Structure 1
Amino acid sequence: ISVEKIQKLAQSYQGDTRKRFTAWGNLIDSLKKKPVKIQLEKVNSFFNQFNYETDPITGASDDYWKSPVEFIVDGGGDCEDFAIIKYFTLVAVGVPSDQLRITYAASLTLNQAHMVLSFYPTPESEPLILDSLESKILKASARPDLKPVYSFNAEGLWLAKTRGESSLSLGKWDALMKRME
């Protein structure tokens, strides 16, 4: 997306919302051309300042992927929603989309399903985990509390243990894209 788009978007709001729009946009403009490690840490940290919404029913995620704009307006979301805006923010600052996957994992600690953002330095690499419930950005192997089940992005779906090529984009991803237009 564009930081000029967000500038536009910021005008159509006020209060603790238009400045979250400008804070968000400044960030993207700030992180352009910056080292990946800086980008990952600052984006992760920026959004982990947002509100963590727990679904009053499931006690976790609901069934609705919030668009980033919605995440900004609502001032937050659940673990899937966190992974989503981090994904798009990082793509905006120039991280190649194919280095980023939204990951559905079994959590041993929370004893339930938990979504994270996985960043892959190189294609064969074990990913770094950008969690909404952990400030540390750690390698997969340093997150034994997490056992991935599947991952996805704009380019496919990977069943855990799938190396390289997509296991197949989800229809649910498509619908989110359409919602973001």
Structure 2
Amino acid sequence: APLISVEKIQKLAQSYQGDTRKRFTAWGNLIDSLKKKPVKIQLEKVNSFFNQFNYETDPITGASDDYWKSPVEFIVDGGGDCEDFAIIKYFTLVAVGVPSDQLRITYAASLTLNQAHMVLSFYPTPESEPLILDSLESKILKASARPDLKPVYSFNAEGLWLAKTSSLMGDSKSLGKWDALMKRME
């Protein structure tokens, strides 16, 4: 189960220069600063730190790009699409100590944009309404406060779940891009 660590990040920073090196250093400092902080602060600061980056879209569809970026690729490129934002936020939150089973990257239909839109969902308990960490909204809001998002499926390092339409947990590796992304991280 692939890992982000401050030590790995510090070494990565040294292999780059200029603003790219600074981005790696800032990412590791973020992770160090958020350990043993209140969950809500962990969520907020990971959300806000990454929300500053370049938001990419496919210039033809206006939606997400085909390729899924690992956290290191996101840092190197200085950004990515909505899916890439959710992915780096996920791995960073696991790194600061939020239990992975409370985090599910969520593929949703945007009823307002008329296109797919990915976010990170945080579940206080499995039967709670999730809190939505988004790249097109600075606030973290409950699912019911985001009626513009209709979840389709969600996933993390461990599993895959279809949105209702408790459920059977598929293998996360059956998402080809996700399985490949996690291997790239090894």
Q: Secondary structure at the match of 2:98?
A: coil
Per-residue CA deviations over 1:126-146 (Å, capped at 9, x if unaligned) read 100000000010000110011
Q: Secondary structure at the match of 1:147?
A: strand
Structure 2 residues not aligned, in runs of 5+: 166-170
TM-score normalised by structure 1 residue count = 0.94
Structure 2 distance, partners of 1:168, 1:59, is: 28
Q: Which runs of 5+ in 1 are unaligned?
A: none
Q: How far apart, CA to CA, are the structure 2 residues paired with 1:126 and 1:34? A: 22
Q: Is the 8 A contact 1:11 1:18 kept in 2?
A: yes
Q: Does structure 2 retain, via aligned residues, the 8 Å contact 1:158–1:168?
A: no
SS of the residue 2:19 aligns to: coil
Aligned length: 178
Structure 1 residue 89 displacement after superposition: 0.5
Runs of 4+ in structure 1 off by over 4 angstroms are 166-169
Aligned counterpart in structure 2 of residue 157 of structure 1, from 156, 160, 168: 160
| Aligned residues of 2:67 and 2:177 also touching (Cα < 8 A) | no
Q: Is the 2:10–2:24 Cα contact (8 Å) retained in structure 1? A: yes
Larger RCO: Structure 1 or Structure 2 (Cα < 8 Å, ≥ 6 residues apart)? 2
Identical pairs, percent? 99
Deviations 1:114-159 (A, max 9, x none): 0000000111111000000000100001100111011111122111
Q: Relative to 1, partners in 2 of residues 1:169 and 1:127: Cα closer, same or farther, differing over 3 Å?
A: farther
Q: 1:58 offset after TM fit, Å?
A: 2.1
Deviation at 1:167, TM superposition (A): 10
1:112 and 2:115 are equivalent in the alignment: yes
Give the TM-score normalised by the residue count of structure 2. 0.91
Alpha-carbon contact 1:39-1:90 (below 8 Å) kept: yes
